[PDB]
Each structure stands twice: as C-alpha cells, then as structure tokens.
Amino acid sequence: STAGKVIKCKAAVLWEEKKPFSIEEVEVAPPKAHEVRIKMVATGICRSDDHVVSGTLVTPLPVIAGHEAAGIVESIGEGVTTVRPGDKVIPLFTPQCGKCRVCKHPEGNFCLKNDLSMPRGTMQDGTSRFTCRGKPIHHFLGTSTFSQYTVVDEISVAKIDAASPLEKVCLIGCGFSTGYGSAVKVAKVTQGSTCAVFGLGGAGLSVIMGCKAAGAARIIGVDINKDKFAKAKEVGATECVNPQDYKKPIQEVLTEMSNGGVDFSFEVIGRLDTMVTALSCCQEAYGVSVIVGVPPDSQNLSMNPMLLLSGRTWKGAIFGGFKSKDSVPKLVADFMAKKFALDPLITHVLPFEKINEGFDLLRSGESIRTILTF
Amino acid sequence: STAGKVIKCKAAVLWEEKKPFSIEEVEVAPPKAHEVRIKMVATGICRSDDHVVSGTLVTPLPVIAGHEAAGIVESIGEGVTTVRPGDKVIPLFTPQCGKCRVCKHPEGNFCLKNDLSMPRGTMQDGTSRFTCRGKPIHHFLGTSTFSQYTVVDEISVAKIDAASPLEKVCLIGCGFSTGYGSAVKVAKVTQGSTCAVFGLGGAGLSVIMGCKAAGAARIIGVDINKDKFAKAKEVGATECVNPQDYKKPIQEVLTEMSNGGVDFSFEVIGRLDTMVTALSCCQEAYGVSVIVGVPPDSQNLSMNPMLLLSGRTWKGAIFGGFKSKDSVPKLVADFMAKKFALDPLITHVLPFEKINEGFDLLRSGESIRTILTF
Ligand SMILES: NC(=O)C1=CN([C@@H]2O[C@H](COP(=O)(O)OP(=O)(O)OC[C@H]3O[C@@H](n4cnc5c(N)ncnc54)[C@H](O)[C@@H]3O)[C@@H](O)[C@H]2O)C=CC1
Ligand SMILES: NC(=O)C1=CN([C@@H]2O[C@H](COP(=O)(O)OP(=O)(O)OC[C@H]3O[C@@H](n4cnc5c(N)ncnc54)[C@H](O)[C@@H]3O)[C@@H](O)[C@H]2O)C=CC1
Ligand SMILES: O=CNC1CCCCC1
Ligand SMILES: O=CNC1CCCCC1
Ligand SMILES: [Zn+2]
Ligand SMILES: [Zn+2]
Ligand SMILES: [Zn+2]
Ligand SMILES: [Zn+2]
C-alpha cells in the first residue's frame, strides 16, 4: 500500500549548526533502481551525529543525520537482489560496493563509494530522496536514520537475522563494531598485552570489549569524566586513570605504569592532543596506536616524527576496519550466539520524538548510548 | 704489541659543527670489561654522519663520528665471550643487549641501551676511551669508526665471516641493512605491489633493492636530483620522478600514477614535508608509509589525522627493523651466498686520509657511498 508511492513521515531535520533538531514531516521518495526504502525501528545517538550539530564533522546542511540503526525493508527498487521487503536490515554508513580496489583488497574497508572524504550529502546518484517544506534535504553518509523512513543504496544496507532484536543490534551499525574491530582487527591486540584506551564512551567501551576478547592482561581506561570508570571496569578495564588527577602529562604516567610504554593504545575521543598523547604512550620500539576519534574539521596536529622513527606504528580506521556488508550479518549472528554483549552500552531508551533530550543526555556526560524507538 | 696499552693512532675528530674533520693523532685506551678494541679496515660515509656536522643530528661534541664500518678485533676486555682477537667484526650503532624488553620482543630492535634517544656520546659505563691533545673526546652511537682503532661495548659488535670482503660488507653496518629491512621487514612489501621511494641515496637504493626482492611490480623513485635516476633504475626502479618537474604537488602526481595511491611509500631523505607527502601518496584505506630519514633536531611536522583515520598505516624504524647482533652476521652470510649486491651502492673508494673529500662528494650530490680504506 506504500510501494512506489511517496511516503510522508516524521524525521528529525537539522536546519543549521548548533541548534536542536526539528521533528517535522518530510516526504520520502520511492526507491530508484538498486535502492532500498526502510522503515526504521531503532536508532542510536552516536557522538558523530553530534559532531554534525557542532560543526566538528562537516557535511552539507540542511540534513537528516543518523547512521547507527536497524529497520525493516518496506520496498526495493528495480534490480535489488540482496534484500526483500520484510527483511530486517542495518544501514551501512561505510558502503561495500564490492567492485573498487579497496573492496577487493584483503584488508581495506573504506569503500571508494563512501560519502565521508568529500561529502555530497546525496544518494550514490547525486540526488536526494528527502523533501521538507518543499525544500530538498541532504542525506548523511548514505544512511539518514533519524527518520521514520529512509532510502539507501543497496551497497549501503545489509540483511540480518530475522529474529534479531532491533533495539539492541542497531549498535552493530556503528559504536560496537567500530570499537571492537579497532581492537581485534585493526590493532590485532595480542594475548597478555597491555592496552590503553583513551575515551570511555560507546566506542571506547567497545574497544575495551575487544581488548578483553583478545586476551589482554591489562586494559587501562583513560577519561576525564570519572563517572565513566565503573562501566569501563565492568566490561574489562583493569584500572582507570583521570588525566586531571595528575601533575604530569598522562603519556608519562602511562609509560611508568606499563614499565616503558603500552603494547596498544587507542584514541577514542577526537582531539588532536590526545591523538599525539596516545601515540606517545605506546612503547617506542614496538608499540601500536590506533586513532578512532574524529578530529575537528580541517585541523592539523603537530608531532615529532622521532616518535615513529624509533619503531612505533600509527594507524586509524573507519568502522573498526570491517568490510561492512560482509561483516554486519556475521556480527549479528555472533550477538545472537552470545559471543559479545550490547546491554552494557545501552544506558537510556527514549522514543524518537524525544531525540533532543537524548542529545542533551550525551552532551551532559550522563549517557553512553541512548536508543531511540520509532 | 698493543694489547693492554694505550694506542696512539690517526682519527678524524670533529671539534665543532660546520667544520671539516681534523685528521690527527688520538689516544685510544685499552678495553675494559665487556669491551672490544677494533682495528678499522673500511668505513662508509653515511648522511647521518654529515647530520652531525650540519647540526641536523645533535650529539655531544667534540666527537669521533662514523658508524658504518668493518674491522678486525685487536683485543678484548675481560668477560667478552662473543668475539676474539683476529675476528672480523661490524660495529652495531644499535646495540643488542639481549636482556631488555625490546630485545626480548619478537618485533622490536631499538634496544634500550642505544645512545640515540638521549645521546651521551660515551661507552655504556658513561666514560670515553678517546683523548686528543689531552682532551677527552666523545663517542658516537657507541661506534666511532672514523679512527684507525675504536673501542666498543660487546653488545655493540657482531662477529662476521672470516672470509668477508670488509671494503664491501661495511655497508651492512648501516645503509644497506637499513633500506633493505625497511622494505622487507618493516613495511613487509608484497608481491605485485606498487612502491614509492623518496630519496635515492645509499639507503633509498637499498629500499629499492628490498622492494624488488619482495616482488613489487612497480617501484617509483622520487628525487630532486635527476642524476640519481640511472642507478635507481639499475637496482629495480621502474620509473623515476623529479618533483621540480611538476606544477602539482608530487603526492597528487603519485596518486594519479598509481590509480588511487601506492601500496607502500618510504621517506628516505629526512624532511618533514616529504614525510607528510610520502604518507599522503599511499592509498588512503590500506596504504603503508615508512619513515627512514632523520628529521632536523627538535622540529615537529604538521599533518591532518584524517590521513590515518581512513585506514593508512604510518611507521618508522631504526636500522631496517633488524635485531642488530642477530642479523648482521646473517646478512653477511647472505651476501657471501650472492643473495644481494653491494657494489651498486659504492661509487667511490678513497683512503681514510681523504675523509673530507669524501664528504664533499656526498654534499655535492655526486656520490652514493664512498668507502674509506684505512
Ligand atoms: N572511526 C569510526 O569509524 C568512528 C569514530 N567515532 C568517533 O569516536 C569518538 C568517540 O565516540 P563515542 O564513544 O560515541 O563518544 P563519547 O562522547 O560517548 O565518548 C568520548 C569520551 O571521551 C571523554 N573525553 C573527552 N575529552 C577527553 C579528554 N581530553 N581526555 C580524556 N577523555 C576525554 C569523554 O569524557 C567521553 O567519555 C568520537 O569522536 C566519534 O565521532 C565513533 C564511531 C565510529
Ligand atoms: N632510520 C635509520 O636507521 C637510518 C636513517 N638514515 C637517514 O636516511 C636519510 C638518507 O640517508 P642516505 O641515503 O645515506 O642520504 P643521501 O643524502 O645519500 O640521500 C638522500 C637523497 O634524498 C634527495 N633529496 C634531498 N632533498 C629532497 C627532496 N625535497 N625531495 C626529493 N629528494 C630529495 C637527495 O637528492 C639524495 O639523493 C638520511 O636522513 C639518513 O640520516 C640513514 C641510514 C640509517
Ligand atoms: O560515527 C560514524 N561514522 C564516522 C566515522 C569517522 C568519520 C566521521 C563519521
Ligand atoms: O645512520 C645511522 N643511524 C641513524 C639512525 C637514525 C637516527 C640517526 C642515526
Ligand atoms: Zn567499494
Ligand atoms: Zn557512529
Ligand atoms: Zn636490549
Ligand atoms: Zn648510517
């Protein structure tokens, strides 16, 4: 009864930076060839969505943000072969086209069809499926999940187990998989190692889960908000340190605690200074540091290249290094088999209509993940 | 006739920065416990020695520089078990104590006993074995090979094949092993990959040798001195580019040439700008860039961390990642088995007395390696 027709529904439109989202009616076009229209069931509030509001992450406005979500296929465009109406699905903010040099590479996952490097805020075809007040509205990372319905390209959606609890597995669309993969796939944390994790939010707690699954002997959580320490320990941190408690720079503290530097460090905040601090705190000859946090737009860090010449490895990754369409269904299957837990990340639940209150909870420091239900 | 006695011999003393080496008599004390006195046979002129003259690399002056060399043991102090008088040896500018956390780690080689990070210019015991005109003279990287005789700690010397040609294998003490290992051990260049090598001197040509040995399909040499291109192609470069020939930044040129970025890049110059350029020219999702060049003292580079967040890996290494005492004898054995060539790196052979002429050849761009013979 809606296939092939424009759908009028509610979405959270961001009309300008540093303002609340506007919950209002939008018009969602039917899917074109190789596109999929999805009825959203749950969406998470991720810090990267807040980065759009703050101007930290630049993407064209006005926009429908949201990228961590799960829903049910309402209709498919011509030529779609990988999902059907009624399937449970997770939108993929990093696509997997399967045909570019990155998708064919055994390690790479940052598909060249992504809308992150040079953001257009459109579908793959350069157009938008959203209208509000008669005005076209931009998409976000090819997902735009802050809406009762969205349209995504086929390369940006994965079919998942039909029995999946969508109000939990939406975290596999961003925060969990990013942190977990950063530890187990990107850093490749080894058994018995010492790890330092900077930032104990949704993504940082998932890094800790990955370090524990990898068998690390020590996992040092670092955060300036000591209220984050209790949950960090519950999911595997062996100790937590607040840089504000020390008279010395925390890289010096961490080097002393690890008797010469840590095996693996992770920056899971998004600050230039903590990116350099995290690199510095890993052991100078064989340490590995992984950047996960999103830096402020167009800003350069400053560092001494002798930190690398001694032997350190520095790398970063999107989405924990996972090839998105291959990995999301397998991660859901592992969740269904109890191989990892998502409940520790979910601190608050709200209806979609209270999205602004959910962003208030994130900004105040009180929440890890708020899940919004449509 | 010299064991247990002070030796008066010829050495090249650097009394202050930005001056020629002073060829004059020095006194070399006999070795203390766990020390080895070596009669030098051949020593190479490496850019890192010139960095001491220029102030690029800070180490205490006055100094006997030189670190790439081979010689014959004249005497050993009490407790030495790994070399004997008469053995052919290569001094190790990176020690291998075998007891520190780095030496025990399967991948680390920057032994904590090194004199690089916080240069003292002494023996391990904090004193010097050199006197000139009655004044104590500093050591350099625990080696100090610009002298007819030197004294090194046991952890900074490796015994090599008694049939080795010392006027060639001295290059295993620095330039060859650094470049070769940077490709085959640090970067782990893969078969069929595309590589870019910035800087076509002794170390850069050895990187090329390693990339070819690893089966790279394309090896792009980059140098502002087009006179370096012929030898680079002889040792494996498939193409060479001079950044001064282009109106665009070379990172953009290399990205176009490689249809989206190279698999492996190497900075083998020692400039902050080319370190960032080399990182940028590797493929954004899976490329690897290795810093080999020594940066000017105390200077920071500036870079956008999004270059790493997309998926790039950035690392550096000392001495090609090789555990020094384990690796040097094995590399000599490989050379004797004809597994690699050193003659392509040697452009000039001069008597030690012509050390300053040898540095003039390096500074003018004319030489790759000048070998000085004692
Ligand atoms: N690379 C990728 O694919 C992804 C990147 N991100 C980015 O990772 C970062 C973390 O995301 P979330 O965990 O969702 O955000 P979050 O805001 O919940 O967690 C950040 C934590 O860092 C702490 N913090 C802030 N400043 C600090 C400082 N100077 N020192 C120590 N701790 C500090 C905060 O107290 C907070 O607990 C964000 O920048 C996000 O945009 C998130 C998921 C995907
Ligand atoms: N990491 C380690 O263990 C070692 C580091 N090094 C360092 O590697 C670097 C190279 O050493 P060598 O090969 O012996 O020196 P080299 O001086 O013979 O080679 C440097 C090359 O870079 C070229 N070059 C200079 N500026 C350039 C620019 N803007 N753009 C492109 N090319 C440029 C020069 O024309 C020259 O051919 C030095 O900084 C050296 O101190 C050397 C061996 C050990
Ligand atoms: O949070 C999800 N995606 C992020 C990934 C890093 C760049 C900004 C967008
Ligand atoms: O060239 C030999 N050794 C170099 C190693 C990198 C720092 C300066 C000295
Ligand atoms: Zn792709
Ligand atoms: Zn996210
Ligand atoms: Zn050691
Ligand atoms: Zn050298």
How far A96 CA lies from chain B's nearest CA (Å)?
13
Which of A254, A175, A230 is closest to A207 using CA atoms? A175
**Cα(A206) to centroid(ligand 1), Å:** 11
Q: By C-alpha distance, which of A329, A328, A351 is closest to A167?
A: A351
DSSP assignment of A194-244 equals EEEEE--SHHHHHHHHHHHHTT-SEEEEE-S-GGGHHHHHHTT-SEEE-GG
Q: Is A14 in the pocket of ligand 1 (CB under 6 A)?
A: no
- Count the residues in chain B: 374
Task: Locate all alpha helices (DSSP H) within A47-173, ordered by sequence.
Answer: 47-54, 101-104, 166-169
* B179 contacts B236 by C-beta, under 8 angstroms: no
Experimental method: X-ray
User: Does residue B58 sit at the A interface (CB-CB below 8 Å)?
Assistant: no
Look-up of token digits 């309402």? A74
Whether A67 is a known active-site residue: answer: yes
Q: Where are the beta strands (DSSP E) in B223-368?
A: 239-241, 264-267, 288-291, 301-303, 313-316, 346-351
Q: In b/e form, how buried is each residue of B133-162, taking b as 16+ CB within 10 angstroms? A: eeeebbbbbbbbbbbbbbbbbbbbbbbbee
Resolution of the determined structure in angstroms stands at 1.5
Q: Which domains does chain B have, with CATH numbers?
A: 7-173+342-373 (3.90.180.10), 179-317 (3.40.50.720)
Mutate to test the pocket of ligand 1, among A43, A45, A48 (most ligand atoms within 8 A of CB): A48
Token look-up 């020094």 returns: B324
For residue B368, give every residue at least 6 positions away whose Cβ sits within 8 Å of its Cβ, in sequence order, or none: B201, B202, B205, B231, B345, B346, B347
**Which residues on chain B are in Cβ contact (under 8 Å) with A294?**
309
**Smallest Cα–Cα separation from B124: which of B148, B157, B149, B102?**
B157
Q: Is ligand 1 within 6 A of the CB of residue A271? A: yes
When CB atoms are compared, the residue of A110, A259, A311 closest to B285 is A110
Q: How far is A130 from chain B (nearest CA, A)?
A: 28
Measured in Å, residue B48 CA sits from the centre of ligand 4 at: 6
In this structure, which residues have their CB less than 5 angstroms from ion ligand 8?
B 46, 48, 174
What is the rounded distance in angstroms from the CA atom of residue B343 to the CA atom of residue B351?
18
Among the listed residues A315, A214, A327, the one whose alpha carbon sits nearest the alpha carbon of residue A266: A315
Q: What are phi and psi of A127, to 5 degrees?
A: -120, 170
How many Cβ pairs within 8 Å bridge chains A and B? 128
Contacts of A239 (CB under 8 A, 6+ apart): A218, A220, A221, A257
Q: How far apart are CA A335 and CA A332, in angstroms?
A: 5
B268 lines ligand 2 (CB under 6 A): yes
Distance from the A312 Cα atom to the nearest Cα atom in chain B, whole angstroms: 6
Residues of A in contact with B299 (CB under 8 A): 304
Asked if B278 is an interface residue toward chain A (Cβ–Cβ < 8 A), one would say no
Residues flanking ligand 3, CB < 6 Å = A 46, 48, 57, 67, 93, 116, 174, 294, 318
% helix / strand / coil in chain A, to the nearest 5?
A: 30, 25, 45
CA distance A72 to B43: 72
Does residue B48 have an active-site annotation? yes
A110 touching B (Cβ < 8 Å): yes
Kindly name the residue from B34, B46, B139, B281 that is annotated as catalytic: B46
B3 touches chain A (CB under 8 A): no
Q: Calculate how far, in angstroms, residue B201's C-alpha sits from the geometric centre of ligand 2.
A: 6
Separation between Cα atoms, residue A144 and residue A119, nearest integer Å: 13
